[PDB]
Amino acid sequence: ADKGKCGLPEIFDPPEELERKVWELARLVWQSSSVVFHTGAGISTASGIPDFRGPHGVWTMEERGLAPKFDTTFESARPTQTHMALVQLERVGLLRFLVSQNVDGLHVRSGFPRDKLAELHGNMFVEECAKCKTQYVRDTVVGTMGLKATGRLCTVACRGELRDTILDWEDSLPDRDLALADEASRNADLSITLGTSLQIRPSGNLPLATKRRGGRLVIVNLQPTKHDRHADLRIHGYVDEVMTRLMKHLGLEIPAWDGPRVLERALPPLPRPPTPKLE
Amino acid sequence: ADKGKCGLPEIFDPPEELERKVWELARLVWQSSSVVFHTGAGISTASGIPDFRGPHGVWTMEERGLAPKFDTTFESARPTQTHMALVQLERVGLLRFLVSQNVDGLHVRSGFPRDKLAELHGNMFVEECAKCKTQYVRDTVVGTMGLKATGRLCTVACRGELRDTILDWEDSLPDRDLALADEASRNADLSITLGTSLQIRPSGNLPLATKRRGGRLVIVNLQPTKHDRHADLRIHGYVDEVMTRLMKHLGLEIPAWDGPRVLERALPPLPRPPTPKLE
Amino acid sequence: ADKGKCGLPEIFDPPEELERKVWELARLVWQSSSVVFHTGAGISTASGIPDFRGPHGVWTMEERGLAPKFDTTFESARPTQTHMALVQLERVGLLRFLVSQNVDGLHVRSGFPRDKLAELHGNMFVEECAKCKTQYVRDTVVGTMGLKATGRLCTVACRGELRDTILDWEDSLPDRDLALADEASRNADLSITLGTSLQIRPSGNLPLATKRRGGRLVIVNLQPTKHDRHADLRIHGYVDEVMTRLMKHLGLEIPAWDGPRVLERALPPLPRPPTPKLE
Amino acid sequence: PFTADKGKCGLPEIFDPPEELERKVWELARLVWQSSSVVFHTGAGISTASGIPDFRGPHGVWTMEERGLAPKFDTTFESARPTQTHMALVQLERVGLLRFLVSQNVDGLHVRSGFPRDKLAELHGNMFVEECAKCKTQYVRDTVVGTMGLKATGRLCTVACRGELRDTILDWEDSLPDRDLALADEASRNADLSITLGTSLQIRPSGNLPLATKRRGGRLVIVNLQPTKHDRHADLRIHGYVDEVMTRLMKHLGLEIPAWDGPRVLERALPPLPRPPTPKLE
Amino acid sequence: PFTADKGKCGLPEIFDPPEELERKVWELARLVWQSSSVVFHTGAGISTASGIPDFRGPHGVWTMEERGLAPKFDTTFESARPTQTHMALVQLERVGLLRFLVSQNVDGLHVRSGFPRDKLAELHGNMFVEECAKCKTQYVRDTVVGTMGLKATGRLCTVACRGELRDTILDWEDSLPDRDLALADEASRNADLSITLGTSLQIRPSGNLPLATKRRGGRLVIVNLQPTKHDRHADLRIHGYVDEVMTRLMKHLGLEIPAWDGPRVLERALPPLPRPPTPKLE
Amino acid sequence: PFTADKGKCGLPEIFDPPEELERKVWELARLVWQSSSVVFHTGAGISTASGIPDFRGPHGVWTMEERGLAPKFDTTFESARPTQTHMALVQLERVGLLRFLVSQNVDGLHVRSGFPRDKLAELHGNMFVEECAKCKTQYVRDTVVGTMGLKATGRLCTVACRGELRDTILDWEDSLPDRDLALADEASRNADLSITLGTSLQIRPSGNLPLATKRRGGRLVIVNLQPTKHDRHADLRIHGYVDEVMTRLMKHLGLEIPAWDGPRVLERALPPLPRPPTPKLE
């Protein structure tokens, strides 16, 4: 398979400059009416799950003929500070939609509302019914990858064949998830990309669609990305450090993780701090 | 009055078998899309309120020419672990409707949402307006039984006659409550009966209507019931022990009781654990 | 400007009588289906913000050629026990609408829901867009009074002129806020006025509109008011003392203040205690 | 054993009318406020609202035995939830309004509610506790041990002993554990108020301890639905449900009754918490 | 009484501009961080944002008296809610950043906020507290006792005494309670930082105690809207509202200001809580 | 320095199959329940799930060095969040199931999780802590000090000293701090159970301390993905992720793993909290 540029050196913005940029980001969150986050494997490295195209990334290790390292199971992985921050942004109405490429299930398990998430590449923990299209979010990883049969049957009242939701190398993106994602991206005045290299054809382009009709793009990545030149702001730092500085400037706590929890529909919005004066 | 079979010996399932059955129940809660609970006086014995047809039950004591025992007032009675568990099941979306024969007011006082409860036999604590059909949930028991005048007047803007809601021996069941209850029972793939003997004509039949079109019935009672042969699972144990084991297997806390609280309309659903893999 | 009667002596109801009246008020809250609060500067004196027409009030001090005293900034002012009590009344459904003359921003900052508040005289902390009528709730006081330009521009996607929302001496009342307020007052069976003298022409009359078609008026003020003769109950005491006694009789806690928080839309109602028996 | 003296059983119940009841609970609040040293004495009446029948009440174990009937249990000892009264006493210890607690119940619900073991004397023992014959070390288990009358359970001591574990349930001829009796006698002796909840006070050492408070000026309060052995020695008798009494009392004191996290053992009392200031009295 | 020395009243207020204000609150944070022993001294200025007028401020009791006017109260002593400043000091004690607290206020709001009585010296007394003439025992009441100048209230001691209860409000000629002064003098003497909030420091023993910190190297900080007696002895003077200053300070320290559960007395300090690690300084 | 003995690096990992894994975590729960004195020994394996690479694991610093590669950090030491394992150990101290904690990590996450410093021995030091050469006083900072090998940071002591502040990071030839080693040796000596999480036990004083538990009857448990120096001395070896093991263990114990409020220092352990009653064993 065509696996794109792997193992680029990383960039570390100096602290003075890094604080300047997170204040810029905060201003843009404040200035905007419609914010989408797009997330990749990078938001999960700090919970012990390796990325694909970083120094110790799955593709990168393969090329040096090495195995990537897991410091946790998918089951025992805890959502990062960045995961819980996105939960809080959605709950106070500063985050309209969230689009993720990750198959690791941590967005859902963090208690992010499923009706505001597009899982572009699917979910280790989710089976679909080949007959009635019903989704089961399970407590362990299903067992298969590539939309093959798990050997469990639908229970609605059906007995249809349940399959995995992990695309293989030629599978089309789920249409509902891709549709919602394209809508959210097109109709945004701010897209922010966290821990994605933006190299995958459909998924990595959607942030650019925010730039059509005047909208700002922000990119938060340790490595260069495919679209660095299209950004209004590029932040080279650990997303956790970036996201904790950001919540602090927004006057928002990062909520505790109750443990693995599914929320299907978003709850009505909670109160948030008032906006600073700007310009 | 025709008062049915009273004082049957009780059954105690051995522990090994009891744990096997509560795992069966949990599987059925997991497998189902539409769960109704039906509750009788048995869920209230552990808060000091005696049942009707048990060893020390009101009807049973009468026959041996004895008085039944109250270890609490209706006012000072605290909802049981089983009451608070049903509150939590509704709040995480594992319980669609609840149908109760009890007049003791503990469902409402536990903070169960009234728009998801049918009080088939009425409520010590509730007056209705004979004119505009408005319901007042009071902090003490009204004073009368049999739909007679309390001597308090409606306050909407009416001055109509407020009466008790406790049926006497020939009164028809409230039509709205009976209607909602029959709907919830018919359109369920799982009914579970807790602390009811199922001997009363309209009320005790509704669980059977779940069995039409493929639906499962579960019965949790210390004594035999009228419908033991129709069940898919029979659990002979204390509902509190059963319900605490069940919540544990579902990965759900039993909430604290804030004290006496009326919730008219159900709130949108809270997150719940993901489902195990089954078969 | 015509500034009305200033500096009247205050009245202090004796304790026996004061407790009798707060029990009367509580009965009326219990008896009613539709309660509006109207609030003036008096609910803010206990957080260090002086009133207009009291002994040490802005107008009153001017006449004796004195400056009124601020013991806090608008920014550092904390909502009073009366503010947080009104938050709790709205959240348990005992308060339908709230109408305030205060420009101090404490209702909004207490986390009262904006869709249930009419700010009749505007808000130090709020800018409006002269073009698209969009409102920005800021974290500091805007800088101008009298609907003049702040020198900040709209950010929707507009670049329109943002102005203050503080009426000057001839400006018409905001039409949406006045409209909602007149509706809420007309269709109420109980209006309660807290810390207002009711001297301002549109604002001070709205409580009277509750008295049309049988509705009760209650007035809580240390000084005489314009409309004392129209009231069913007059309570001469500190609103904080009155409101804490009231919540106690209603069996309701006064919530902690999380700090400055904007809630745009009201959340669905929380459970409340059941009603006593009355007459 | 069989011929043992089981006392007066099944006496009629008394119900103070609502008026006389509120005035009495207000009077108790006053005695708590006025007192520098409050001991509580509890019996099986604090456990009936959690599904456990008493001994000498209308459906009490002894009372049903005399009529040839069986007491009814509405739960196991394991699934039993501490009452409003149990949780209210945890709080009174946590704000310093309760010096000591002396109970005759073996149901374990005091310990399971999180009451600190160093401020409680379990006069008749505890179904959940086994001792070591050698070590004298106490294990608090998540289930009932199996035996009564201080017999070997089948488990051994795990200090590093391998000594014999035994139940703590006294039999008819068995003396009281000397440590619990001694602390209970001291706490009762130097109390300026004893309040007895759900006990009829017929058992010889246990039922007399509140009288030791009445020597040297101390006040005694008896809350019970039936007459009790010492009704004549009381300064205040309250005929009502201990839950109603304790919920009113706490309300007068301005204290909230704590949630029960589930079965939880606390060996040693934590330092005191803030409590409301005292009303002005006379 | 009438002729008594009431000091300089109604001085003009000073307002540090926003810039100079943030730099000064950052400088205070640094002094807290650097110091192993922080005492606070409070006066009536911490109580004005809760509706209680001061003595020597523009609308202060003495200041209005001199012009022939009356001070205004925006609440009773009973309905008065502790300020952001009161609750912030509770927290600083709970994380170990405050060794002792020395207040001249008689409004009781320190005690009512849950500040532990063993780490606070009530130099001028407390409206809510009566002593026993005989016992010397202190009762903290839910309402103001009635009298000032150490006169009998009409209540008697309830230790088991029947001794005379008296107010603790000092009069003009009355000495300071020796215990509170002694602890305040010790805490001030061995402090390496004293911070004074809302006091003008004119009263002779009370106002001098922060200077005792300045002997043997100690730093003194004065936060006050008006000049104060000792402005010249300070290492840092902050002209702003004590609430704004304390809310900024806590934010710099990474501490949250606690909710007030309502009127609550705590006799003895609880053990310390975790607090954020220190910034690197110079 | 360069030639130093770095031990066996990059050994293969072992994965106990699910069945054998649950039976082993149940067996550990039993050993905790049976034991009166539990010490934990932690190494860099408890920090890998928070983005910090270990030393001798497959991508461990030493292991990558040997292959000519660089270890990867998924966060700074400052933005690093304590793991499920870190927070689970805080709780076990708070309910009295953990007597002492002995760690070889310099990452500071134990202290930052709110683990009380008086029940923990930081054998190899702490990036966030500077000592005073003169005072021997320790400052816990909000950022990493700058240096390793006990060299001057550039800051001075603020006790009132002006002494030299130094890092606490041991170098290759540096002895262990005598106080931490002494407490660790005592706690290990008198423990009836040692449990080692994420250490390969190759460092000479630190790795041997769990063996001191095995003298005079004590049980030793090793939880580690790779073989360790002392695998043969263990009574129980668990090959799995320390998070999975600790989350199962806590569930068996009926304890919840606490939220992390953010970076918070606690000098002295608080008194114990209630914990569930013990299961009946054999």
Ligand SMILES: Nc1ncnc2c1ncn2[C@@H]1O[C@H](COP(=O)(O)OP(=O)(O)OC[C@H]2O[C@H](O)[C@H](O)[C@@H]2O)[C@@H](O)[C@H]1O
């Ligand atoms: N803590 C961190 N902070 C910031 N950036 C980080 C961090 N850790 C890693 N990164 C950066 O995070 C970036 C991760 O980029 P890639 O590894 O390509 O992941 P994707 O989500 O874009 O891959 C998309 C799909 O391709 C796959 O085949 C699967 O199908 C995926 O679903 C790097 O550039 C790191 O520098």
Ligand SMILES: Nc1ncnc2c1ncn2[C@@H]1O[C@H](COP(=O)(O)OP(=O)(O)OC[C@H]2O[C@H](O)[C@H](O)[C@@H]2O)[C@@H](O)[C@H]1O
């Ligand atoms: N803790 C317990 N766990 C399980 N079962 C229990 C428990 N306690 C009691 N039971 C069982 O609980 C069952 C209770 O059954 P019945 O007493 O007939 O009550 P109903 O609600 O069905 O009576 C319906 C109406 O009839 C009346 O006239 C009123 O009008 C009622 O509204 C017994 O079989 C006990 O074994």
Ligand SMILES: Nc1ncnc2c1ncn2[C@@H]1O[C@H](COP(=O)(O)OP(=O)(O)OC[C@H]2O[C@H](O)[C@H](O)[C@@H]2O)[C@@H](O)[C@H]1O
């Ligand atoms: N703690 C207290 N408790 C009760 N009453 C109080 C308290 N404190 C003060 N009061 C009473 O509170 C009353 C305050 O009345 P006014 O001062 O006229 O304020 P408004 O809101 O009615 O003025 C309306 C507009 O007029 C202005 O020009 C602005 O445009 C305002 O928006 C007094 O009668 C006090 O006795």
Ligand SMILES: Nc1ncnc2c1ncn2[C@@H]1O[C@H](COP(=O)(O)OP(=O)(O)OC[C@H]2O[C@H](O)[C@H](O)[C@@H]2O)[C@@H](O)[C@H]1O
């Ligand atoms: N809800 C209630 N509220 C108040 N009182 C109650 C309640 N329920 C019951 N009572 C009263 O509670 C009282 C309980 O009286 P007894 O049953 O003799 O209990 P003991 O603890 O004194 O028995 C001591 C020993 O006797 C044995 O030999 C064992 O060794 C026991 O340990 C009754 O008078 C009820 O009226």
Ligand SMILES: Nc1ncnc2c1ncn2[C@@H]1O[C@H](COP(=O)(O)OP(=O)(O)OC[C@H]2O[C@H](O)[C@H](O)[C@@H]2O)[C@@H](O)[C@H]1O
């Ligand atoms: N919000 C505020 N922020 C800051 N400072 C304030 C504030 N409000 C007022 N102030 C200042 O707070 C200061 C208060 O000064 P004084 O009123 O003399 O109070 P004391 O506590 O020193 O009086 C001591 C004794 O005097 C009597 O005889 C009694 O016995 C008293 O106990 C002023 O300078 C205000 O500028």
Ligand SMILES: Nc1ncnc2c1ncn2[C@@H]1O[C@H](COP(=O)(O)OP(=O)(O)OC[C@H]2O[C@H](O)[C@H](O)[C@@H]2O)[C@@H](O)[C@H]1O
């Ligand atoms: N998630 C995990 N679960 C369980 N074990 C793990 C995990 N991740 C890693 N491990 C294991 O964790 C183990 C860590 O072994 P080492 O890296 O030698 O750490 P130390 O603390 O013993 O090094 C001591 C000193 O050595 C230096 O010189 C410094 O001075 C250090 O302080 C491996 O065996 C992994 O298999």
Ligand SMILES: O=C(O[C@@H]1Cc2c(O)cc(O)cc2O[C@@H]1c1cc(O)c(O)c(O)c1)c1cc(O)c(O)c(O)c1
């Ligand atoms: O602790 C004693 O009983 C246990 C506690 C208890 C209670 O608190 C309330 C109640 O309604 C019943 C009740 O039965 C319990 C019990 C204990 C046993 O050891 C036992 O064999 C049994 O069948 C049942 C006990 C003590 C005694 O001294 C005694 O003589 C006796 O017969 C029993």
Ligand SMILES: O=C(O[C@@H]1Cc2c(O)cc(O)cc2O[C@@H]1c1cc(O)c(O)c(O)c1)c1cc(O)c(O)c(O)c1
């Ligand atoms: O404690 C003293 O006053 C009380 C506290 C207080 C305050 O904190 C702020 C304020 O704005 C006013 C204020 O009045 C209070 C007060 C106390 C009385 O005893 C009293 O008779 C009264 O009318 C009112 C006091 C002490 C004094 O030494 C004194 O000389 C005096 O006149 C009064």
Ligand SMILES: O=C(O[C@@H]1Cc2c(O)cc(O)cc2O[C@@H]1c1cc(O)c(O)c(O)c1)c1cc(O)c(O)c(O)c1
């Ligand atoms: O504390 C030591 O390192 C720090 C802690 C640490 C860790 O916990 C896990 C990890 O994956 C890497 C790691 O690097 C840290 C570090 C410390 C330094 O002082 C330093 O100069 C550096 O580059 C990086 C240390 C101790 C040593 O004894 C030693 O010999 C050494 O080289 C380093």
Ligand SMILES: [Zn+2]
């Ligand atoms: Zn299907």
Ligand SMILES: [Zn+2]
């Ligand atoms: Zn009607």
Ligand SMILES: [Zn+2]
């Ligand atoms: Zn606009």
Ligand SMILES: [Zn+2]
């Ligand atoms: Zn032993």
Ligand SMILES: [Zn+2]
């Ligand atoms: Zn005395």
Ligand SMILES: [Zn+2]
């Ligand atoms: Zn030093």
